[PDB]
Amino acid sequence: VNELERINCIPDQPPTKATCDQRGCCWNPQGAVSVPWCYYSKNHSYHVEGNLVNTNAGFTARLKNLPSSPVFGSNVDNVLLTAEYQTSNRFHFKLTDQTNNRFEVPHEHVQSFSGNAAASLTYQVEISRQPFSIKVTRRSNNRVLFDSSIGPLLFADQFLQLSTRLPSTNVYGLGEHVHQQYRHDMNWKTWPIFNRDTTPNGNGTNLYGAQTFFLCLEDASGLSFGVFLMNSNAMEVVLQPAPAITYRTIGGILDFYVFLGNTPEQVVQEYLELIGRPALPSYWALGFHLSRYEYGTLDNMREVVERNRAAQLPYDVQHADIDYMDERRDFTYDSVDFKGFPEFVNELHNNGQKLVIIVDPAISNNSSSSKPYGPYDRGSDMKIWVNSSDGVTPLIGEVWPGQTVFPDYTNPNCAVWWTKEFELFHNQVEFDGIWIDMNEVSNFVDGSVSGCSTNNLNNPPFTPRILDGYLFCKTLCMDAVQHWGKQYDIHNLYGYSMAVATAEAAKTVFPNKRSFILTRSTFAGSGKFAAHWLGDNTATWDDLRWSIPGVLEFNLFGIPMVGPDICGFALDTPEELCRRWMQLGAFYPFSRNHNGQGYKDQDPASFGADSLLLNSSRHYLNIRYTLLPYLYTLFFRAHSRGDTVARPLLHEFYEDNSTWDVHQQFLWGPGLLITPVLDEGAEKVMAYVPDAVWYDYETGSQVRWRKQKVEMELPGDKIGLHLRGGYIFPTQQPNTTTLASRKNPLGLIIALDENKEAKGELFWDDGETKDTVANKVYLLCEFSVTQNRLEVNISQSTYKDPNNLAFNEIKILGTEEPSNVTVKHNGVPSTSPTVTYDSNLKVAIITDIDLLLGEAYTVEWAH
Ligand SMILES: *[C@@H]1O[C@H](CO)[C@@H](O[C@@H]2O[C@H](CO)[C@@H](O)[C@H](O)[C@H]2NC(C)=O)[C@H](O)[C@H]1NC(C)=O
Ligand SMILES: *[C@@H]1O[C@H](CO)[C@@H](O[C@H]2O[C@H](CO)[C@@H](O)[C@H](O)[C@H]2NC(C)=O)[C@H](O)[C@H]1NC(C)=O
Ligand SMILES: O=S(=O)([O-])O[C@@H]([C@H](O)[C@H](O)[C@@H](O)CO)[C@H](O)C[S@+]1C[C@@H](O)[C@H](O)[C@H]1CO
Ligand SMILES: *[C@@H]1O[C@H](CO)[C@@H](O)[C@H](O)[C@H]1NC(C)=O
């Protein structure tokens, strides 16, 4: 064995020859740091027994265990391999215990496959007999994509493992973690996955969510593939420089999907086609959100709101954290400190703003006939709590209010309970959206108020390297019991089940509306239901840098509406950091400035009504709002086709290997390049300029750089923003709310390519109705520019905005002077627009034009 290819046989303890011999592995204490001294042999594992059997969907094989002594339990004797050729670009295989049913994720979106093997496969599947291995290769070039032959298949009740070689080291994904870099180096690295309330810091631990998806860019041609494991048990993913990746899990079954694409974007699209495409956000959820833990009183909250309104900050949503509650209890508000709450909400609404309230899962069990607590009384009547292992007594833990029980959101009768709680509360405080937190689930005691019994669930043969080394640390007992099964098996599905139930509640509370759900904990497929934030970060320059890979990864995971707490949750934010963070933060898909308890104010206006930070924050938030029709159309493509929103350079520029590890810059869709200053004291950033025409957003000027590293001059008041030649960006005059800004004149920014051509599109609907796309109530138009000509073209036309909207300005970058501008409407001429032209910058701006939204036009000019 070449040392890069050794598969570690002692993941659980420091390596010894005696343990190696006892396990029947190979011993070689010679090797570079991290190279396993003890590793699985060439042979041993499982072998194929007899022949493969053709089925309608693909094939089955029986695998029989090559005997050895138990490591972490003894391998299941007979394993069944079921292989389904589901589509041309998606292969599914699962490994089950041939004799017993095992836990399988009861995913809400994924359906069982029936039907026949797809035609025109882009992949071929190869099975080796002795020992068992599975290989998936790309048909067109025979590139080996998945190849398990590097390691054994291990399949014991509480220890399952399968490895695969990888065709390159361009590997992106896995979660939820702070990876720090976007491209995984492929040096010996183990990532534990198990939903846990812990700080997203530099220690590389398991965080709030469970995401097994990874994408691999195979080569410069763009050809890419992805892998997904459908398994909700505690697990870790081991990366090594072969290159190779091992999945090591402690229950369930190995249920794998392999996705192929011509480009990275097509791999994400194939993945989201399987697990579920993201929900379309309400248009208002794309504006700026402001928040903090512990305003303390409504007076203090109103004070913050009003100083940011007075500053003309674009500011659509105010969040209210646990301080609104009466003693941190769900579905109450503090009648003294938040006296006047309903009247404040009216004020918010009348100002065009929205209210999002935090709701925790854990319910106070403190209720007597003297002093009733309704959510607990109604919950106990319905019998909808998570129970201890006896299957009958509700588990007691502790969160914000004191001792608590936990809803079992897997029980469909729990959504009924939860919905009524929301109905009852909305009658008091008319919130518009819901922020669901602490849903790993997070417990202030370990397991329960009486701890956890010693047994194989709470104390398993092998524990992945999760924070603190016990599964029940700061969560529920592993033998706690829910409708979908035991906590051991479904722990990673709590936040997922809770987002599903919460989306159910929205159907009653916000009939026909999307509303907004923000969730902490996630499983694969959570973006169908919710936005995500990156959790309790810290006001450091490290946390600023680390945010970008975290945002890009959740876009691969199909949770495109994602961002961190701008300026940092924990700690007092320095002015310089917060100013650089607000500049970048104006371009996160989810843009929220949120702050921890006790720390100095960090809302933009708090820095002073004439401060650089406020001026800069207002400036870039106004740019964000200007480009909201472009951002919104990007979320439309994510929702309907599965595209990313916040996009890596390498997804558009994969032919250039200089982009393969860029994580300090990113794109909005194909066309907008964002380059933040991310270092203290810097007024410059070393940045990559991909192989395209680029125009400075602010001046419109063509940059002299192409396909090269540059130092971009970015003073205290700037972030780099460039528009790609070849693309047309729809815009709308901004205002301090989207309620108002949506009524304003539209514009087009045409960035010309070398041939003086460009293309773009605009999606437009009512901005809030649920499933306008599935029910086809929307406008979609295309803009295309050739020499001397712009065409506005309508493809779907089943929504006409009642506000009489129109394009009143067109800015053309990289153009020679356009003259004699003519506008035709469905063929008919007329009259004559104004053109202003800057021959130095090659910018033309056409005004005094009125192109109605949803109407076809041709706009023509001479040179
Ligand atoms: C948790 O325990 C409760 C009892 O405390 C179980 O409630 C049962 O619910 C069904 C209706 O769905 C009733 O017909 C039973 O009579 C209830 N039992 C009792 C003793 O009242 C609940 O099923 C348990 N949940 C889980 C996941 O085990
Ligand atoms: C941007 O938003 C505000 C709403 O907050 C609009 O404010 C004014 O609009 C009208 C003036 O033409 C008045 O009828 C409203 O009373 C007034 N609202 C306020 C602040 O009192 C403003 O018009 C919007 N901008 C644009 C271009 O429409
Ligand atoms: O006391 S804290 O440090 O703030 O508790 C955090 C962890 O529980 C804790 O750090 C844990 O990891 C240590 O064991 C918790 O996540 C805060 S929540 C999430 C945030 O967005 C809201 O504003 C907060 C109030 O609702
Ligand atoms: C690792 O964890 C501890 C917090 O318990 C902390 O002291 C340290 O900052 C963390 N390491 C890094 C480098 O983030």
Tab-separated table of C-alpha atoms and ligand atoms in Angstrom, residues 180 199-205 467-468 542-543 546, ligand 4:
chain	number	residue	atom	x	y	z
A	180	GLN	CA	-11.926	28.082	6.921
A	199	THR	CA	-19.472	28.025	18.654
A	200	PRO	CA	-18.478	28.213	14.998
A	201	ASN	CA	-14.800	28.749	15.748
A	202	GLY	CA	-11.375	27.646	14.561
A	203	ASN	CA	-11.511	24.173	16.154
A	204	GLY	CA	-13.292	22.369	13.309
A	205	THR	CA	-16.026	20.727	15.422
A	467	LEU	CA	-17.381	18.028	20.603
A	468	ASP	CA	-16.980	16.695	24.207
A	542	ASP	CA	-11.184	35.519	11.442
A	543	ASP	CA	-14.996	35.211	11.733
A	546	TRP	CA	-14.697	32.356	7.536
B	4	LIG	C1	-11.152	25.736	20.806
B	4	LIG	O1	-12.066	25.756	21.913
B	4	LIG	C2	-11.871	26.601	23.048
B	4	LIG	C3	-13.230	26.987	23.635
B	4	LIG	O2	-13.683	25.988	24.524
B	4	LIG	C4	-11.174	27.933	22.784
B	4	LIG	O3	-10.343	28.194	23.896
B	4	LIG	C5	-10.367	28.061	21.485
B	4	LIG	O4	-10.441	29.401	21.031
B	4	LIG	C6	-10.821	27.163	20.333
B	4	LIG	N1	-9.800	27.152	19.288
B	4	LIG	C7	-9.757	27.979	18.229
B	4	LIG	C8	-8.398	28.155	17.598
B	4	LIG	O5	-10.737	28.583	17.772
